Symmetry: D2
């Protein structure tokens, strides 16, 4: 059997409710040895080793967990056939993309969680975890970057996003679709991501102890500039704008960010709009202001690539090419 | 023929391309008599009168334009058979919802835009504008609230959202679906909104000249609490959290807003996730901290209802009632 | 607690899997008396009486089960507060619409199934059944027509369709969206179908022991007319064309069906295309040929309305009126 | 500039009616010179040669047009830089997959239609044609198989399907998603089909004047077996079942096709259900009956691969291996 390491970080898959039909619970309550033993069939398709890295709700996910996870996987790559990371759904799409750019291991790295607490009727965690291990054990899963396996679907860490607050089917790759579908432990893979990932990226966090400070500001009618101004006064290295439409900024946010960019704050235009690219050549002259367009990266993912971009360069022209290749 | 008043506010429907093949353009620079003459077929279905209220890209939409639009429709209601507002697509969903709560005219009020500039090769604007006027002149359009007509679809102002940065088919009612489909100038209406709108809401902005201050903060991994701190230091009346998953907040944004809530800032838990409700009875005890759950309202829409709720009450229990009925 | 009757017909929610890691199985095995025993929680929300009316895979669903189901509900209406019908997922969308037209009981009639076998890890059935009973027990579910409750969503029987082959989230109301979402045993209803259902239809199967014969022919490049020829020769009362695009027909199929319409076979143009209306005033002159356009009814659902229309009228103009109202 | 051959076959892109505003029209009315002359901007990107192969509605597409199109592309491959095929939307997805398998030219072959006739207000054809020519002229479009370009999207000919009867955005790759998006004449390609196409298929139609006879039968409640019997009685080479759910058959249709397969008719189980795979190891024991499972191929596309499969072999076991590779 392949050797699979489960790195547990918490989430609703480790999530514990008061009853089976009542929606109240706490993420990150159950340990990894209890997750594995709840699904005995795991032991017939893989030699499973668990470690608990942290036990938090992914709403509390942060740079320190991200750095720990990249280093652990890079370090233990040689000692295992594949990794499964149990994680909350809330920021799974962020950790998946971060590991997609930082992991130098091209063994399957699969992230999995659950939308329903382990204590609820029709808990999705068990089958998700089973299918995550199936995916991490498949040689065909190798070299596709960091994968998210939820609801019988293998999704790439770059395009995967939580599209719904409660549905077991919430995770979708809203721009380019999934890599594969799992039926009876077999994966019909018809796609692989084209942007560079894992071992093909220049980002190496092995020596990094902290990442550049990147904040996100929301745009909306009558938007306040206070959020943008607070991040600039705090000396943030980068700001992502969750623009309206094709990455457009409310006038006062535009002014504050246009200024901050002249003073060498990195500014990426992304969109609150869940699907499609924030493009160049629309209503914002990026060249004039030193702004980067995020393409299909949504604000929280844009933050991820900007943080890693700002470990190599502060040049907007170079951050743009980073955003066009990763 | 029915009298239809078109109130122009700008946007890409009044948007001017550098060219037809080229995607570069400026929003809100063509006047309203130019939109009407550009579609002469309107003259056979309606008696169209145009007024220019403003000429802005809707990325710059604000409280003043909203109050003006509401005051104008309420004043002119008995002068016309229907309104069509031309509007930029970027913040159309925010404007439609505001007017859906504040307009006391139960004549059809229809909002329309274009995703491609008028100068573009297969400009969506002419047909949108025709169908908006058709919709505004159908007697069956009355009593459904403020409508958005885009891509042959009638959407209610509450649920409609921009789902894609560039696609002509971007506007979708992502939780509950459209009200109707237009073919050959006929509308198959199979739905009507259940939530109270227009003349069944207590909200009256007719003697208001300013609205309560409500800002939105974004949640993500390692989120800064400075955006939230800046808004409470500036004495914002209300804060909407674009939370992760089912309205969850990052640790420090939590601690900051929980203190703000107990010092009389209205705090609404919404979600960055594009579909589904921020529910009560998940991971956050709203009763303990005095938080309101937005339900299906996305952050920018939750802001609109919070702004209005704060003209009547600052009691969180009552503001939750409002979010459960409007 | 309210009185809820579960009428079992079979399906994957009774479908005993080969096991937990296996999606190979047989639909129809277990019986009503041991549904309330697998889901003890039902006893906290309803006084549940279960009757088995048949035990089949819903791929074998037929006119006889439809008539017995409708007469059952009509007869027992006054003896219960609400009905749940457990059903295979494959033809749920047909039965649901059949009942939606023929049931005269305006108490909740809720259909429910399961996409995963009862033996599967993360089997969906139990929570679906719980939620179906919550929906049947909620007095706000009254007068909305026949309901399908799957994946935490209340769907109307006219628009619900199976969109995916395997996904637990397969059931969507693809044209007009769902009526409500269920969270923590509470339903947020924001819609009700406008089309006439149950009590407001003139269809009465109370005295019918048989239905008109309506078949379905598929269109595609180089479509054979032999399917259409065979149903016309066998004296079928009605043919539903699953056309290409906007209900268009291959020339030789168009030919057979224009002749059949002339010899008094009822012909309904529908579409293989999963979403959108088959409209009048497109490429087919329906007035000329005696054809009816199905609107948003897909081929299967249009079969259901044609069968029932044919019990009142054989006049194309009148069948078209029926198609524009139910 | 590159040499782009447009092979015209007709469709609504070459369709006209009496009105910009009225929906009535005839497909395949306008010649290719009129389409090209309608978009002068073409002259700035390609050296366009147009040939009229046929002028039909794609509802009338047939095996002769398919063979003519495959032979033309194969014969003229070396004389041009890329091909654009103007086609009706109704059976585009069928033709596109036929060519994806039979074309041996690996220059861009791009198909394109319009959902609105050329005479309509906001006609989609012009910009779709511009973008199909941009796609055929882009060197990144080579080696991705036959492409469909619609609504700014580059779609692979295998997964693409028409999802809506009227919407300009109807074409989606519903299982695996699109290959690329077009903004401002630039394609962000992030995917390529992994299933073998064009020059890696063994299928060669260069010597064929006929394709084996394959018909499609539809499954529903109380389905008639006469359509299936009628194709067997006519000695059809192949039958594709449009099954319910995961490729299931009504009892009479099952019996007729079990019988037929026993007697040497190739039987493919597909599904009426628009998304997801018809899988093996579900409720039908395919090995026992000699049935092939379509995977993600819908009925009309399973017909294409079965027709070509039947030119190499009649062994169900080998036809299944083809459905797993192409
Ligand atoms: N708050 C939870 C939600 C989930 O896991 O589904 C988390 O992200 O950890
Ligand atoms: N920025 C433009 C976008 C549009 O109109 O499509 C506006 O919102 O005014
Ligand atoms: N084949 C089953 C499908 C299911 O219930 O999931 C049935 O329709 O009976
Ligand atoms: N019937 C037309 C429809 C279209 O092209 O949109 C065709 O397929 O030729």
């Amino acid at each position: 059997l392949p050797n699979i390491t489960i790195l547990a970080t918490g989430g609703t898959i480790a999530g514990g409710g008061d009853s089976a039909t009542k929606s109240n619970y706490t993420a990150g309550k159950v340990g990894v040895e209890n997750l594995v033993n709840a699904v005995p069939q795991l032991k017939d398709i893989a030699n499973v080793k668990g470690e608990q890295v942290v036990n938090i709700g992914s709403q509390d996910m942060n740079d320190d967990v991200w750095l720990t996870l990249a280093k652990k996987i890079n370090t233990d790559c040689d000692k295992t056939d594949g990794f499964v990371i149990t994680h909350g759904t809330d920021t799974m799409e962020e950790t998946a993309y971060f590991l997609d750019l930082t992991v130098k291991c091209d063994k399957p790295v699969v992230m999995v969680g659950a939308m329903r607490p382990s204590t609820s009727m029709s808990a999705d965690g068990p089958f998700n975890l089973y299918n995550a291990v199936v995916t991490a054990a498949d040689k065909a899963s190798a070299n596709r970057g960091v994968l998210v396996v939820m609801n019988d679907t293998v999704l790439d860490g770059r395009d995967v996003t939580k599209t719904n607050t409660t549905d077991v089917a919430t995770f979708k790759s809203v721009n380019y679709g999934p890599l594969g579908y799992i039926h009876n432990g077999k994966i019909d893979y018809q796609r692989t991501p084209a942007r560079k990932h894992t071992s093909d990226t220049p980002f190496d966090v092995s020596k990094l102890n902290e990442l550049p400070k990147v904040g996100i500001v929301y745009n909306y009618a009558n938007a306040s500039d206070l959020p943008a101004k607070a991040l600039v006064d705090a000396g943030y290295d980068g700001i992502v704008s969750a623009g309206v439409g094709n990455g457009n900024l409310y006038k006062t946010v535009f002014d504050t960010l246009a200024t901050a960019a002249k003073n060498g704050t990195a500014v990426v235009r992304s969109s609150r709009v869940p699907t499609g690219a924030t493009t160049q050549d629309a209503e914002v002259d990026d060249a004039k202001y030193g702004f980067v367009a995020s393409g299909t990266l949504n604000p929280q993912k844009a933050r991820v690539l900007l943080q890693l971009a700002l470990t190599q360069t502060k040049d907007p022209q170079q951050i743009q090419q980073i955003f066009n290749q990763y």
